[model samples]
Target: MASRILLNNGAKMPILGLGTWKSPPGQVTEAVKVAIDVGYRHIDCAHVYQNENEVGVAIQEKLREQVVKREELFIVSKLWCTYHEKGLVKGACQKTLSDLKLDYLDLYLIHWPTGFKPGKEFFPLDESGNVVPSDTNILDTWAAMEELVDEGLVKAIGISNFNHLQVEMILNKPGLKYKPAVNQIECHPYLTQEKLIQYCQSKGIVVTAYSPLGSPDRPWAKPEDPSLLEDPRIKAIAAKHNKTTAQVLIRFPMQRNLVVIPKSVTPERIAENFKVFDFELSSQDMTTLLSYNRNWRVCALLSCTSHKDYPFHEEF
Candidate 1:
């Protein structure tokens, strides 16, 4: 199987990547180093992850040692909601580039469709305990993103957490110079998002699956929630292939020709997650996994639901 997918802009992205969200501070650097040593060519990062500096440490050391050259690795970062203003867009990319210690990012994305108050607070909230929305329009923000490509600050630009209609709006924009090359969103067996994946694929926009293991360690996860890795059906399929439940979950998206990024801080798990390329899940197993979709979303940005441009309000 090809390990990379060709983007609309002709850039190659690894089908499997290491996600840095929620990776603990003291361990992320080493985790990143080990991931690179274990054959991970892509690393997904964001300013909100709060670990880019540490991730940069590993990347810098790797490059210094010639473990991987700059061009051999693909690094992705997202523009946080607070920086949606057109004026703040370039600065945000510069900040992340500085933190990652790289000249330019391989791909940059608008973190979400909704904008937030411009400032340091990731989730700027009102006294009423609700997320405050910025007056800046996302289309204006997207226009600014196009400027990054023109300036060579980022190789490609895209969006994350945007709904089908939101993507369509961007596509229909007048005088558009570059189309979004990828759409990153939460995807797993429990929330397959078949229609959204189909829609993006038809437009030649690659779909990237985040939280592919169902984000069991997410901060807000409740004790009673069902764990995707513990599901009996998934476990059964894992045993059939002599793989772990994680291997099954991580491979699910790859089988559909979508990019999958599974996060892990443990060295063993990180190496294990990369072992899926040797085997293929049967067609029946793929259908069985798809049957588990309950439209369940693990990373719902509930605080921004009241925002006018909230993308999850409509069915994808």
Candidate 2:
């Protein structure tokens, strides 16, 4: 089992877990089962992934065998950005709950800072493909999230892919009783996000790093997008430790007390991702890896498209 970290709200989240983005429908169920068997307590899910139902089925099987209880497993799910309306947030969460066949999610995150109209698709462009603005703001959606905690629909509320400014907006809101417990962002040696991570830490917000392996296997992105496993710096450190470069990528983030979710659908790869907890990266190696930060981003949504909160214009 991986070590645990306490969220600002006192909930315990696993230090390492399995991420299910881009997990094909053909093999997601077995991937979840094998990951749990190999000691992954945290399983991240989102409505956009469209595989929560299949993933939940595998987890339900383990529950039937008494291998793990709902409480022991830290299951996470996210509300899609398009469903941020006050009236829609509750239903969105309830739909995920029904799909997962669980009463509540361990951690439910506002998938992104962007909040669209209740019925609008993410790319709500006209026939000309020009984007329009929505009346709702992110803070309004967060208020609805607070209600979920009050009604016991979700244990805790979190955010993902938010910059410092977005986080500040939530923190500064009045009548806000529940602050975010976690901020899930695309983080790796390439996209270090050191300052943002440190800022969240200062505000008592725990941050989770997604795409920790640089997501070389991400099907949508080009395969030759400079694989992190083959990166000379990570490879040199891996060679010295006799561990794969991927392991070092995981260890570097784990050493910093951050939660990491690396996704893999293959049995061997799923088992191998959980094995990151066994080793430690030395300080010399840690700093050396940290120095290679180029603020590289593997996932850039709403960039090529016109979104109100696109990072290019909405910098923190």
* Model 2 lDDT tens row, 1-316: 2499999878899988889988997799999999888888999999889998998898899998788988999999998867878888899999898888789899999987776545536555566655554567778989999999999998999898888888998999888889999999888888788888899999999889999998876656775566788889789999888888878888778888799999999998787767776677888988888888876778775433466754434444
Residue 207 of model 2, lDDT score:
88
Q: Point out where model 2 deviates above 4 Å.
A: 120-122, 130-132, 302-305, 312-316
Work out how many backbone clashes candidate 1 has. Answer: 0
Per-model TM-score versus the true fold: 0.99, 0.95
* Cα lDDT listed for each candidate: 0.94, 0.84
Candidate 2, residue 284: lDDT = 90
lDDT of model 1, residue 183: 97
Task: Candidate 1: give the clashing pairs.
Answer: none
